[PDB]
Every structure is written in C-alpha cells, then in structure tokens.
Design a protein around this ligand. Structure first.
Ligand SMILES: CC(C)(C)C(=O)N[C@@H](C(=O)NO)c1ccc(-c2ccsc2)cc1
Ligand SMILES: CC(C)(C)C(=O)N[C@@H](C(=O)NO)c1ccc(-c2ccsc2)cc1
Ligand SMILES: CC(C)(C)C(=O)N[C@@H](C(=O)NO)c1ccc(-c2ccsc2)cc1
Ligand SMILES: [Zn+2]
Ligand SMILES: [Zn+2]
Ligand SMILES: [Zn+2]
Ligand SMILES: [Zn+2]
Ligand SMILES: [Zn+2]
Ligand SMILES: [Zn+2]
Lengths: 517, 513, 519
C-alpha cells in the first residue's frame, strides 16, 4: 500500500474525481407529444431531412409558446440546412417577454445514424456548451433513435462535456461552468427514462477508466493503481485481493515477475470479485493488461514512431476492467460471478531488468525464451490467464494495448478480437454492437505457430519470421489457456484518441454489456 | 501481337512459357483402400497419423499384397518411427518378384483433420522424396481422413510443388504413374482431372510472376495473354495508348508515362454457349515492375528486387482464364481484365503531387507514386462497371501493410456487398486458398478529402493503409457489387523463393460454383 | 563459490550443466576393412564417393561378410544411386541368418580430399538418419580417404551434432529422444585411427561444454554463476583455481574491466584456472577469453537495426572456449607445459551506476583510456586481462573474443580472424587451425591506424575516429597492453553462433587445445 518515492515531491496516489459535475445535472425526460416548453438556457433541436442531401431545416415538434413557434416556422428555418454536424444559435423573446436561446444540430439525410455519426452530433452539441455559461440544456429529438443509441448519445454527451483538470494548477479554465439541468424531449419517453441513469453509470465507468489512463506514470504506478482499485472495491462492496510479490513467487508467476524486475515499484496483482445474490449461472474472468509505463525495457522504444511518451496508456486494459467493475458493481446484475483481474507492473531499464534472450518460466510450467523485452504485455497476461483459468470460469476475456500492428490492420476506430471459441467471440461482437464500441474479428492463424518454436525453451515469446504481430501474439496467449472459452481484445490502436489528445476509456461499456447481457 | 521494344539486341522479346509439363504426362489411378494395397512398382508412401498420442509411433493398418513389404511394415519396425507432421522415412528393398521398390511414410501429426497448411507440409515432405527419386511410379496410401476438396488440394499442391521451373537455367526423373489408395475411391476420381487443370492454371500464373521484368513487360505479358486466348478460343482485345487516351484513363496512363514499354490493357472474355445468367468481371493488378517511381523503393525492407511480382493479380486472373476456358462452365459470362504497365523513374514519369483525371471524371491528387496500383485499378474498375456485370472482383498486390495484418498465409477481402463477400469466403473454403474478411471503415473516408483534387490517392496519417486503399477503390464503383482481394502478403513464398500463384483456384471456384 | 544475487526468488542461481551426456554412453569399436564388414542390428552406413565423376554412380568396394547383403550391394544394384555430396538412402533386406538389417550410404561427392566444410555436410546427412529412428547401433564404413585429423573431426562433429540440448525444456521435451549405445567404424589401417577415438570424445565434450555455457541465457549465466561453474570444473579436473572479486580487482587497479561492470547487479568475477605438468615445465601459456555474460551495449545501447541484442548472451563465447579448452587439457594431461586459463567476467548494463561515454578510466598498467563508445567493452575487459596475463611471465598469450561485428563483413561466419605481434606464434595458431579443422585466417595489424587512437586528454582512445576497420583498430588497442610477450588475438564474433541451426558452435575449444598440445 505504501507508494515508494525517489523524492518527497513524488506523488503517492492517483488523483481521482468521483463526484463529477456531470453527477450534479438533474436530468428530466418528457414526451414530445405534450409540446416543448422553451423558458431558459439553451434548447437544441436534433433535426434531419431524409432523402434530400443538405436539405432545409424544419421543426416538426409542437412548441408551447406563441413567439418561439412563430420564430421556428418553416419559412424562417428554410435558410438553414441539416448537414451532419451543422449547428446554429437563435435568440428571441418568448410569451413571458423573456429572452431565450434556441438552436439545432444537423443530423444529415440518413434515417439511422451510425456510431461515428452520432458522436459527430454530440461533438457539435458540446461546442455549443463550451464558451457559453448556461445553467440548463434542453434537447429535442426529432430524429429516430433506439434505446441503445439514445443511451449512447447521453454517455457520449457526458464524457465529451466533462473536462479533466486534475493536473491543472495555474491554468484552470476560469470560465468553467457546467449546466445544472438537462431536459430531453423524445417520442415514447417512458421507454427511454430508464436509459438515463444507466448512461450516467456507463459514463462514469468510462470516465474513471479515462482518469486512470490519462494519469501519468509518476502518479499512476503499480502501487497507486492497486491502491485505487481497492478504494473502488471498498466503495462498491466488492470483495478484493491484492497479490504482492511474495504471493506471486509462491504462485511461480515467473513471466509476470520478470517484466517487473527492473522497476522501483513492486508488482501488484489486482483481483476484484462481484457475485450476484443467489444462483450463479455464469462465471466470468476479465483480464486487463496493466503496464503503468512501457519503456520497452532493454529493447528500448527509441525508433522513430515508437511514441514512448504515450506509454502511460499501456494500462488501458486494466483501466477498462476497473471501469467495468464500477459499472457492474453499481448496476448489480443477477446470476453472474465476475472476476476483475490485472497483473500490474512497470517495464523499465535497470541493472535489475530482465534481458533479451532470458528464459523464464510461467506459472503453468512452460519455459519462455524472451526475444524482445518490449513484448512484455503477453508475458504478464500469460500468468494472468493461467490464474484466471484456475478460478474455474466459463469465459476468459482479456483486453490489452498489445500490438502496434493494430494501427496497420484496423486503425484507430476498430479494436480486434481474437479467440479460441466462436460462441464467446460472437458474444463479444454482439456486445460491440449494443455498446457501440466497434470491434472486428481477426483470425488466429495456426500456420504461424511453428515460428514460435524455440531451440532451447518450450516456446518463443515472439516470432521471426512472421511480421503479423497481432496474430502471433494471440498465438502466444492461446498456449496459456488449456480448456476454457477465451477471447482477446487488442485495443492498442483505439485506446488513445490522437486527434483529441486524451483516452477514450475504450472497452468499459463493451465489457459491461457483455457481462449484463 | 505487338513488337516489344529493346534497349540492346540481347534484350528478350517474349516470356518463355511451358504449356506441356511432365505433370500432364502423369497417369493417375485411384483405388479403394478397403481392398488392400498392391506394391510391386516404384515408390509407395503411407500417410499416417496417431490421434491422441503426440509424436506417437507409426502404425500401418493397410494389408499389402507383398510378403517382403508386409514384413517391413510390421508394427515392431514401424514404431521405431514417429508421426510428427512432415517427418518421413523411406527404404529401398526387393519385393516378392525380386524387383526393386521403395517403401515409406509421411507423418500427419496427431490431429485427425488436416488444415491446408498441414496438408502442404505433408506434400512438401513427399515432394522432397520425389526430387531424389528416379522410379517411374509413386503410390500414395491415405491412412488419414480427407474430404473431396482437400484431396483435390493434395493433388494440386503435389503437382505444383513437384514441378520445377527451369526456363531461365542454361539425380531424378518425373514419374509416369501416380496411384492413390483412399476410402470411397469412386467419389474422388472426379477430382483428379480438376486438380490437373487447377494445377496448370496455378503453375501458369506462377510462370508469369516468376518471369523477370526484363522478360515479362507490358507488351510481352499482353502478347502472352493473346496467345492464351487463342489457345482457349476466348475472345480477346488489347487496348493500346491511343484508345486508352480516347477512353481518358488518366490514372492508368499516368503510372505508365515513365516506362519504355507502352501501356497495354488486357481484355479477355469467356462466354457460355447457352443463355447468360451471370456476368462477372475479374480485375487483376498488372504492374510488371514496381520501382516505386519517384517515391523510389529505397527504404530498408522495401524489397525492390521482388517487384517483378507486382503483376501477380494479373497472373491470377489469366490463370483463372485458363481454368475457366478449359472447364467451360455454363450460363456465365466472364471478363478477364488487367491494366498493365510498368512503374519507372524517368524524365517522363508522373510526379508526387501531380493531379490526374480518371476516366469517370474524378481528379486524383497523387501523394505517393508508389501507391500506383490503386490508380491503375481505378481506371480498370471504371472500365469493368461499364460492361454491366453482376459482380466485380479485383485481386492485387496492393498494400505491404497486409504483412502486418494477416501476414503471409491469409489474404484480405474488402467489399461493398455482403453477399459477394460471403461468396468469396465460401470460394476460399472450397479452394483452400485462405482469405479473411476485413472491414471498409467509413470513418476513415474523410482522410481522402483533397484540398484541391476531387480525392486524395493516399492518406497522410491513417496508417490503416489496406482499408484506406479499399476506400479509394470503392469511389470508382458506383452501383455494382464489388470485392477487393489484397494478396500483397500472400503472393510470394519467401521461404521457397517462388510464387504461390495465389488466387487462381480461389477465383475459379468463385465462377464455377 | 559465491552467492548469486536475485531480484525475485524465481531468478535462477546456477547454470544447469550436463556432464554425463548420452554420447559418453556410446561404446566405439574400430575395425579394419580388410577383415570384411559384418552387418547386423542397427544401421550400417557406407561413406562413398566417385572421383572426378560428379554425381557418379554408387559403388561399394568393401568386403561384406554376408552373401545376401553382398548380393544386394552389388554394382548392378547400386548404379541407380549417385554420390552427390550429402545424398543419403536407406536400404532394407534380410541377411544370411534370416534377420532383417538396415543398410545405406551417404554420398561424399566427386573429390577425394574432403574439406572440413564438406565433411560437416556428410555428418549432417548422417545425423538426419539418426534422428527420428530408434536405433541401438550405428556402423560406419569409410570408403573414402581421410587422415587421422579429419577422421577425428568426423567423430567430433557426429557427436556434437547428434547431441540435443534439453536443459531449458520443461513441457516440450522430445518424447522420442533415444540414442544409440554402440558405434562401429570400419576403416583401412584401423589400428592407426584408434587413438583418435577417445581424443574425439574429449574434444566433443570440451566443445559441447562451451556450447552449453554460451547457449545458457544471461539470467542463468551471469558473472557469479559463470565463475561458479568454472570453479566446479576446476574441482572435477584437479586444476588450480582463483576467483578474484571486486576488492582484489580494486587492489590490482583494474579500472578498465571494473568500469564495464559498474552498471551490473552482478559483481565482477575474474576467473583464473591453472594446469601444470608434473614434469619440468618447458613452456608457459596464458589463454584469455572475453567474458561478457550479457552485452546490452551500455549507454550506447544496441538499438540500431541488425544489432541483435537478443543474441548478446553469446558475448562470453571467448570465455566458454577457454573453459572448454581447460576441460580438454585437464583430461588429456599434456606434459612439460603450464597453462593459465583466464577470463575477466562481467555484464555490460544500463544503470544509474553505469560507466558513461566520454568517461576516462585507468587500466591496471597505468594507461588512461577515453571511452568513446560504451558498447566497445570487450577490449576494455581484455586490456586488464592482458596486463594480468603478462605479469604471470608466460611464453605465449592467446586471447579469443567475440570482439567486433565487422568480422561478419571481413571473414563472415566460417573463418575466424587472427591478429598478433609475433609471426611464429601466428603460424602456430594457423597450424592448429589446420589440425583441429577450426578455420582461421591471418589478418593484419595495420600500424598506420594507430594514430587515430591518439586521445586529446587521455593516453589513448578506446575506439577510432576515422577508420571503420573496427577489427584492426581493436587489435591495435589491445596490442598497447602487451609489452614484451608473444601475443595473438582470435576474433570469433562472426563464427561463434550458428545462425542457420540457431545454436552455438563451441568454436575455438579444439583450436586452442591443439595449440597447447602440439608443442
Ligand atoms: C514493438 C512491437 C512490434 C514488439 C510491439 O508490438 N510492441 C507493442 C508493445 O510495446 N507491447 O508491450 C506495442 C507497440 C506500440 C503500440 C502502440 C499502440 C498505439 S501507439 C503505439 C502498442 C503496443
Ligand atoms: C508503401 C505503401 C504503404 C504505399 C504500400 O503499401 N506500397 C505497396 C505498393 O508499392 N503498391 O503499389 C506495397 C509495398 C510493399 C509490398 C510488399 C509486399 C510483400 S513484400 C513488399 C506490397 C505493396
Ligand atoms: C559496433 C562496434 C564497432 C562497436 C562493435 O564491433 N561492437 C561489438 C561489441 O558490441 N563489442 O562489445 C560487436 C557488435 C556486434 C556483434 C555481433 C556479432 C554477431 S552478431 C552481432 C559482435 C560484436
Ligand atoms: Zn512493450
Ligand atoms: Zn506494452
Ligand atoms: Zn508501388
Ligand atoms: Zn505496386
Ligand atoms: Zn559491446
Ligand atoms: Zn561485447
């Protein structure tokens, strides 16, 4: 629990915001058939025009105000169009002779919006929220969205609206004011009301993950991260267990322990557990890669394009699992038992570091020839997977920033899923659809297995020949699951939002939807 | 035929092609294994596995009609050997009639069902024995389980790997007979002559790919296509620069500008005798050498000495033309297309930054002259859609990034129509040429928005270049089902230093079934 | 024996060493061909060639004491097979006693004088016949002309290549691992070749022992665990031994060697083994091996493409060769000679405690050295070892080291390079290269390059500025630490590791031993 320091100025904990401004927003949902009351703050209409590309804007909703209705006549709205992402502000007086702000956001010509489309809309909406001190936002849905897309709108709204200022000091935004009320007008609102607080849960789980990832490696280290996981578990009444080095040694986790050797921080294996009250139908282990900083070790990330300064993100997998733990522990699903696992450590350069060429022994007794110390993720998951299987679960799903090759195969939008079981894979893909976090199925090609044959050890860590890293890595991991349905989600490409310079918190909602449904 | 230009009189003016191979002279018999085996001639090899027992002992179950070989095959002798996938042994001995025979086995592992990767290992081990064999007959006994497709794969692979390409050259002899013992022999007999056709289609494509760029150029390759068309009685047409200019194929012609060889657009057509119920266009990338242009392949690992293989897509299509023109399917009309050129460095070459206009009217800003494949394909695809076909399938050594996604075994397929993709995937299964469905991610499309042209050729940032390329090609197919097979990673067999002729059997199964 | 420091309790604390190998269980019998060949159980392989006629037909000229086998192996039956170098075939037949026997041949080409490289091709073919076949015996019939040395080389290579290192296998041990118990050899003038058999078995293990050390990863083979293994070897051979630690190294003022090791968690250990004859000593020799148990490069980290930092466990190959030579010498026990076996062992790591590029360090002979590259550490450790060596007062100093990557561009992977300050000694190394069949080539120490080692602040630069001819410059540097003693330097950076087979060669063991013995 005691975070070691080099100097007294070194942080001893991760700053974490639980009570966010988003949580102080009173969210009300009304049915659109009763007409919209425009009284205060900003009222935004979500409007589209099916068929006609860049077609005119029309407000079909009934507006419980004479003046505002007249303003929003088709004659006045004709000049503006519905191009996806477009937004305009309006200013007028209502029946009460009060000034009020109104606007709209263009949702395009398609009848149904995709994942990227809805995010575009939310991002336009957020630009209306920034640099404008408002106390209330009202959103009127004049497009068709199902419950999962509606929930996604809210989660995305909350996430993008929220600004992380934990590490700001002399440069806090002096104009940072959040709305206190959120009104939503939608058709058949009763069915959507339950999606509100689910979205706020999904929002924080994601933002919590984001907070851990964005936290630099001097704040977020194996000790502080495991201390944080404990605190979360305590707040959620989850059972928790943190495995220290001596316990890890008894479990003979040589692959995991070797990776952490060069670090000033002791390895910490995180093990949280949720169990439903009553009969457990499904037991699930979620495994997240928890490298708090990845320098590459003696295979130092020195080559152009290696992006060593991003490598605080190499615990994004762990963060996803902890975010999921928040969501699951909050929403309390029935008939499941969930283990949240992460072999957390740091990959550093030291006199004590493991070397290229070292042969190390995993907890399942397999000897491993280390070909590249910067392929340290699969080493820690190997021992984590053996641990997961010993729990006697039905499903093991690991999530990890494992291979840079994902940027060349799927890019920055879709994560890859590999596995040994088609049913689990389809459950993952299904959860991908309902969580609106895109995943694509990639193959474990067995012809490459021979390239992991070692002359001296039981198996090679990395291949040579084969340059298909994501597949070879999946081949390696498969060797540490003997007979359990297993899947592997490589989020190396999608975890960090390069354009926005922040984490996505990718995987929290995906893993939660998998566990819940 | 066109006169291929020369720099010096020693420059070759055609691609040497072998049509009649020793493989075609092999007489193939298929016997049912239930009746026991005859072993009086040549080389006999047993395909053996041991389920459950990894690297377990060899055990031969078949009864053989020779006492001398029966003693050799007894369990106490054979258990000295093991069934590790690819492991083989063979011994020479006299049989009952005092004739010299050779007897052995190839291990097939401990898994009862072989993948095509496993089967290729087995065949390779077999071929190695054949390359040191002078006997006239090989007999293969399947003490394993294979379905009709995998058995046809076994024969195709055997024929292909057995054959050695000696065209450019200035201990063994080819067998005259092949015997097969296998359960339910009658139902496999129809796969033999299909395997012999698939073999040559694959091997012919292989000859074109392996043909160096001084032998195989746009003129000589198009000449060969014509000669293939003439032998198969296919309709054919070669479009030269003048008619390509009139068709306004600015993208295609821009790539060729810097070459001493004029661009040649290959168009072969197979039309069935009966009514036509499906029209297909098959499009193959045909770069006879890819230097990279002014974006020269100079970086470490760019493997410029390999780039004679950049017309592998074209070879696959032409090899498919052979199989289709030979097997003569019904109710179908197939167009075999290839915009052939050479990508070179010259005073006349297209430049990075040049804005060029495709035949469909779109202007393209060239960001990288080494992304030349998609430019040629763009005009090819515009040509194909004007034919009014139900399906357009293109196949191309398009993006090196395939090595980082699927690697050297699996090709990637992208497309705009789920039905066509599933048909490709189904064809991958029955042809045993592995292919994986990859996505065309629409969120990346914005990276192709040019400041000045209608569209960018490449992205500046995206990194997912195989998908970005697919998005580029997609822009030139307006309302036809279209799929794109990227064979950049799978075309060349790096370990064996030769082509695979990948795609011939895949495409043929697609049009046949 | 020192205690090996651990970071975690799962860190290994010794090198696993296999002394009693299955090769040592093989009984070898040598017969004269004049008596005829008996063919029974196991595998009987004829080594045949056909002079002049490339890929000519196989002919078996040896007498075979079996009518059935003789009939099978008659000219008319063999002419369908050819003698292409490396070709092999298996035969099956019943002999005069109605027992089934296995026979065959390995083609030895169309040249009567087989080179050491072509002989390795023959042995590898023969080994492929041994693998995946549970045999109790192998018989070899030499129908080619080989001298005593090449015959011994055949046996050494057979033993070495047949052997399979499974020390680090856990779940992936080969279940079908079974070795012959008997080896028969038929050859003309057999009584003259018999003396080579045990010599070959000794040379095999000396070579195989070195290979085990080299192949051992750096978490197993570190300076403490390696010096410990040297102690154990000396104890089994009754060699004198002394392991010098940091304290005594400091007293001896070995600043160059010590600075290399500063960055490691493992303390420096200087190995000193000694063999002395019971007879009057007539010549004294020191053998010096480079002993970097892992070479990360230091602050000049190996991060450049093609630097193969994952191979860097090999960087104690020189030390391994010397220790392998110690085994052979302590076993064969040469007379009238005193041999010192030396290695300044350490690990070149990156650390707050590491030595830095630009550092100026003082060697044990008082020479100050300016460090231009932390990855040029071998010659620093050797500098102090060479000074130490000459203080012993010996006749010859020979060092062996994986020193410079440039060797791959000069001699490649087959020939080692030898440099020196004495012609007579160099000729003897070249002579031992011939009689051991470990290829070495004489390379010059070009004095004109010496000026590029002129330091502005120190007495001498570690590395050159101009040059690029690293192997020669490094030799120039080393020469500065040998005042008045015959000295030779064997660079084995190119030949140490077998890249195709992914294993060490144990190169240098036989070479050094032949050098010790043949004088
Ligand atoms: C360096 C290589 C090819 C071995 C690799 O795949 N590295 C992983 C890694 O360091 N795993 O521990 C890697 C490299 C880069 C990234 C990455 C992802 C988004 S930007 C950089 C992610 C993983
Ligand atoms: C260099 C880049 C990213 C533009 C690319 O994908 N180039 C293609 C190409 O030259 N298309 O015309 C490319 C690069 C390398 C290969 C390749 C495949 C196996 S080895 C090299 C294949 C295609
Ligand atoms: C790079 C240079 C010139 C300093 C050099 O010779 N380096 C040595 C070395 O690191 N000595 O400590 C070196 C580099 C590479 C090799 C090598 C040999 C086979 S693969 C790499 C061997 C020695
Ligand atoms: Zn890494
Ligand atoms: Zn990592
Ligand atoms: Zn190109
Ligand atoms: Zn190309
Ligand atoms: Zn070095
Ligand atoms: Zn070194």
């Amino acid at each position: 629990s005691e975070v070691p320091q080099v100097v007294s100025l070194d942080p001893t904990s991760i700053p974490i915001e639980y009570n966010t401004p988003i949580h102080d927003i009173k969210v009300q949902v009304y049915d659109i058939k009763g007409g919209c009351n425009v009284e205060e703050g900003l009222t935004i209409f979500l409007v589209n025009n099916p068929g006609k590309e860049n077609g005119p804007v029309k407000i079909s909703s009934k507006v419980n105000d004479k003046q505002v209705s007249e303003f929003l006549k088709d004659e006045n709205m004709e000049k503006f169009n519905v191009k996806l992402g477009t937004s305009k502000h309006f200013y007028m007086f209502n029946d009460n002779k009060n000034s009020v702000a109104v606007g709209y956001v263009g949702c395009g010509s398609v009848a149904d919006l995709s994942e990227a489309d809805m995010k575009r809309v939310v991002l336009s909406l957020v630009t209306m929220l920034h640099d404008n001190k408002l106390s209330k936002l009202t959103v009127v849905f004049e497009i068709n969205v199902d419950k999962n897309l509606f929930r996604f709108f809210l989660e995305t709204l909350f996430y993008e609206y929220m600004t992380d200022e934990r590490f700001k000091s002399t440069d806090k935004n002096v104009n940072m004011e959040y709305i206190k009320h959120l009104g939503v007008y939608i058709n058949n609102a009763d069915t959507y009301k339950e999606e509100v607080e689910k979205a706020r849960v999904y929002y924080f789980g994601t933002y919590y993950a984001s907070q851990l990832i964005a936290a630099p490696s001097n704040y977020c280290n194996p000790v502080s991260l495991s201390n944080a996981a404990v605190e979360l578990a305590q707040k959620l009444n989850l059972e928790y267990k943190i495995l220290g080095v001596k316990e890890l040694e008894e479990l003979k986790m040589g692959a995991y322990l070797s990776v952490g050797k060069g670090s000033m921080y002791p390895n910490k294996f995180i093990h949280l557990t949720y169990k439903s009250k009553g009969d457990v139908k499904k037991k699930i282990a979620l495994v997240g890669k928890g490298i708090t900083f990845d320098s590459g070790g003696y295979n130092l990330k020195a080559a152009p394009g290696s992006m060593i300064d991003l490598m605080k993100f190499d615990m994004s997998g762990c963060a996803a699992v902890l975010g999921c733990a928040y969501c699951v522990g909050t929403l309390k699903p029935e008939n499941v038992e969930i283990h949240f696992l992460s072999a957390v450590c740091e990959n550093m350069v030291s006199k004590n570091s493991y070397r290229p060429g070292d042969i190390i022994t995993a907890s399942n007794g397999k000897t491993i020839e280390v070909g590249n110390t910067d392929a340290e993720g699969r080493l820690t998951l190997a021992d984590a997977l053996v641990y997961a299987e010993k729990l006697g679960v039905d499903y093991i799903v690991d999530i990890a920033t494992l291979t840079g090759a994902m940027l060349y195969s799927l890019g920055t939008s879709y994560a890859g899923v590999f596995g040994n079981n088609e049913e689990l894979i389809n459950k993952i893909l299904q959860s991908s659809k309902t969580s609106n976090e895109p995943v694509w199925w990639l193959p474990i090609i067995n012809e490459y297995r021979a390239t992991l044959n070692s002359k001296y050890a039981d198996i090679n860590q990395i291949s040579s020949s084969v340059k298909a890293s994501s597949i070879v890595a999946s081949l390696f991991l498969k060797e540490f699951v003997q007979n359990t349905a297993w899947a592997h989600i490589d989020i190396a490409g999608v975890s960090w939002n390069f354009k926005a310079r922040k984490p996505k918190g990718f995987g929290v909602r995906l893993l939660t939807e998998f566990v819940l449904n």
